[PDB]
């Protein structure tokens, strides 16, 4: 049982490493979702300005 | 001296290792969730004055 | 060596070093459990002329245990040699040890001459 | 070097001692007045190596190590290619190549001791095995210089 | 001297009460930090303050150390009871900050 | 015996989880073992448990334990210096300020009701800000009484030379 206690803590450290990496992946996905959420938001005001310019 | 306490120390030794990673990931998601909305609001506020 | 892969890459924190007193290793093991929680693993290897100690720690607390391990008259570091570029690091240490005996024999022959 | 040993003896007729001091100062100033980069590149291109008091200094190798770096140590790779070319083919450990082999090993020992990045130039050309093969042969002074360079590389290889 | 004595007495008592409350809050925070760091799971532990009379701290420390010393481990406990507070010797200090001995469980001594 | 203080009420703080068992009396709880298993049965047990204080990772607890131990040693030295100045002032006995009531409540009843209650700290605040502000307020409160005691000692030293120079 000499290699079992180090293997359990190594597996817990690997699971904590993957759980630490998942928050960074979701943090990158939110960073892409910010500009992905704003790039469709600019076009709703640009066409609103062009609709007010085409009437003039 | 006894070998029975090794699993009792290894259980909390793994539970603290999981709790540290969960405590780091919760703060990472709590920072990115505000950073994404701050970036989107900065993008729309950057675009509106150029539109007008 | 301690089917496990935690010394070839980076998936575990290990502290290997040589010591000359097991009583200081027991006090360092009690101090590691008292000041860092249940994280060290008690391993003993017969050397000589010496005592081989092996402890485990986290991947973010290696700098904290280096002060107590260095101040405890021990060399519990991440590696005990400078040859770790190859996979594994024992092949580079055997590669340097295969030429070190020849350089020592040439230096001994030149010193005797 | 013999003028410095002959200058230790002193007797009457001290004008000959003033001529020995003027010859030692004129030889030291004339030897130090020459360029080390053009003399080392001309000596390496000429395929002939000779020892000197100022050529064996660590300051000339340390000063020429920075100016030599223009092609990733092309000068040290050319000297190691000349020593490996003369030692590999041409009756190495002989009369002609024995002076340039020991002079190239003694000159390469100061460059290997001065910079720890010269192992890539020897490993790229192939001059690393020439020091180990030349360390266990005749010319034990050149084997002591190559053992000093191999001990200098072995000191930086493992700490 | 009279005004400095009266202001030193009132400021001494008013600073002594807040110093005692801050020392009790610091000991209550350090006991929960050492109990949370030593035991791990679960996060909530049962901690209490035992009021012992004078001259009986050695029996309470020896009974609590012999009773709760096996919780931390089998090699961290010690058979040394009491302390030494002499002028020519400072050994047998019951604490986790010295190399002469350590505690086998979460326990602190408060001497007011 | 001179291994502890015998001129004031002493207290022992112990903490254990909800799965520990004593080695002096098997088959008994720690709550009944605290009062019943005590030496002589005179040990009074009081409530001292507290909730979580927003503790972070395990790496910050080792750095916070040294600052909590240093702040507890500094607050213990400042409380002993203030109590030593109050006992040295010749206004109270040797047992006063160590066993007497604080804020109209006794030490066992006030210690049993200590549920992490403060007027400048809360359960949702960090422990580092209260640990630093408690050591700063205790250090300033000890420094004010030390400066007042030094000014009273200088005033008594000047009053001794003035009274001796006045006559005698």
From Swiss-Prot, chain A:
Where does the UniProt annotation locate this protein? Answer: Vacuole membrane
- State the superkingdom: Eukaryota
Where in the sequence is N-acetylserine found?
A: 1
The record's comment on protein family reads:
Belongs to the V-ATPase G subunit family.
Record's function text: Subunit of the V1 complex of vacuolar(H+)-ATPase (V-ATPase), a multisubunit enzyme composed of a peripheral complex (V1) that hydrolyzes ATP and a membrane integral complex (V0) that translocates protons. V-ATPase is responsible for acidifying and maintaining the pH of intracellular compartments.
- Subunit field text: V-ATPase is a heteromultimeric enzyme composed of a peripheral catalytic V1 complex (components A to H) attached to an integral membrane V0 proton pore complex (components: a, c, c', c'', d, e, f and VOA1).
Miscellaneous information on this protein: Present with 2280 molecules/cell in log phase SD medium.
This chain belongs to the protein called V-type proton ATPase subunit G
Give the lineage.
Eukaryota, Fungi, Dikarya, Ascomycota, Saccharomycotina
Whole-protein residues included: 2 to 57 of 114
From Swiss-Prot, chain B:
Cellular localisation: Vacuole membrane
Residue numbers spanned by region Interaction with VMA5: 1-13
Tell me the function of this protein. Subunit of the V1 complex of vacuolar(H+)-ATPase (V-ATPase), a multisubunit enzyme composed of a peripheral complex (V1) that hydrolyzes ATP and a membrane integral complex (V0) that translocates protons. V-ATPase is responsible for acidifying and maintaining the pH of intracellular compartments.
Q: Which residues form a coiled coil?
A: 8-38
Q: What is this protein called?
A: V-type proton ATPase subunit E
**Oligomeric state and partners?**
Homodimer. V-ATPase is a heteromultimeric enzyme composed of a peripheral catalytic V1 complex (components A to H) attached to an integral membrane V0 proton pore complex (components: a, c, c', c'', d, e, f and VOA1). Interacts with VMA5; the interaction is direct. Interacts with VMA10; the interaction is direct. Interacts with RAV1 and RAV2 components of the RAVE complex, which are essential for the stability and assembly of V-ATPase.
Q: Spell out the family assignment given in the record's similarity comment.
A: Belongs to the V-ATPase E subunit family.
Residue numbers spanned by region Interaction with VMA10: 12-31
Q: Which organism is it from?
A: Saccharomyces cerevisiae (strain ATCC 204508 / S288c) (Baker's yeast)
Gene for this protein? VMA4
Curated annotation (Swiss-Prot), chain D:
Note the effect listed for residue 91 to A: Appears to have no effect on the ATPase activity of membrane-detached V-ATPase V1 or on cell population growth
An example GO BP is: endosomal lumen acidification
Localization (cell):
Vacuole membrane
Listed disulfide bonds for this chain? none
What GO MF terms are annotated? proton-transporting ATPase activity, rotational mechanism
Q: Which GO terms describe its cellular component?
A: fungal-type vacuole membrane; Golgi membrane; proton-transporting V-type ATPase complex; vacuolar proton-transporting V-type ATPase complex; vacuolar proton-transporting V-type ATPase, V1 domain
Keyword terms of this UniProt record:
Hydrogen ion transport, Ion transport, Membrane, Transport, Vacuole
Q: Effect of gene disruption?
A: Increases the ATPase activity of membrane-detached V-ATPase V1. Abolishes growth at pH 7.5 and in the presence of calcium chloride, abrogates growth at pH 5.0.
Subunit (UniProt): V-ATPase is a heteromultimeric enzyme composed of a peripheral catalytic V1 complex (components A to H) attached to an integral membrane V0 proton pore complex (components: a, c, c', c'', d, e, f and VOA1). Interacts with YND1.
| Similarity annotation | Belongs to the V-ATPase H subunit family.
More details: Present with 22500 molecules/cell in log phase SD medium.
What protein name is recorded for this chain? V-type proton ATPase subunit H
Origin species, per record, is: Saccharomyces cerevisiae (strain ATCC 204508 / S288c) (Baker's yeast)
From Swiss-Prot, chain F:
- Tell me yes or no: is RNA-binding among this UniProt entry's keywords: no
Q: Which residues carry this modification: N-acetylalanine?
A: 2
| Coiled-coil ranges from the UniProt annotation | none
Keywords of this protein's UniProt record, alphabetized?
Acetylation, ATP-binding, Hydrogen ion transport, Ion transport, Membrane, Nucleotide-binding, Transport, Vacuole
Where mainly found? membrane
**Entry GO MF terms:** ATP binding; proton-transporting ATPase activity, rotational mechanism
Q: Would I find Transmembrane helix among this entry's keywords?
A: no
One GO cellular component assignment for this chain's record is: vacuolar proton-transporting V-type ATPase, V1 domain
Give its localization.
Vacuole membrane
Q: Name one GO biological process term.
A: vacuolar acidification
Instruction: Indicate the quaternary assembly.
Output: V-ATPase is a heteromultimeric enzyme composed of a peripheral catalytic V1 complex (components A to H) attached to an integral membrane V0 proton pore complex (components: a, c, c', c'', d, e, f and VOA1). Interacts directly with VMA4.
Q: What does this protein do?
A: Subunit of the V1 complex of vacuolar(H+)-ATPase (V-ATPase), a multisubunit enzyme composed of a peripheral complex (V1) that hydrolyzes ATP and a membrane integral complex (V0) that translocates protons. V-ATPase is responsible for acidifying and maintaining the pH of intracellular compartments. Subunit C is necessary for the assembly of the catalytic sector of the enzyme and is likely to have a specific function in its catalytic activity. Reversibly leaves the enzyme after glucose depletion, causing the catalytic subcomplex V1 to detach from the V0 section.
Q: What is the additional note?
A: Present with 21114 molecules/cell in log phase SD medium.
Q: Which family does it belong to?
A: Belongs to the V-ATPase C subunit family.
Instruction: Give the protein name, as stated in the record.
Output: V-type proton ATPase subunit C
The gene it comes from is: VMA5
Q: Which residues of the full protein are shown?
A: 1 to 168 of 392
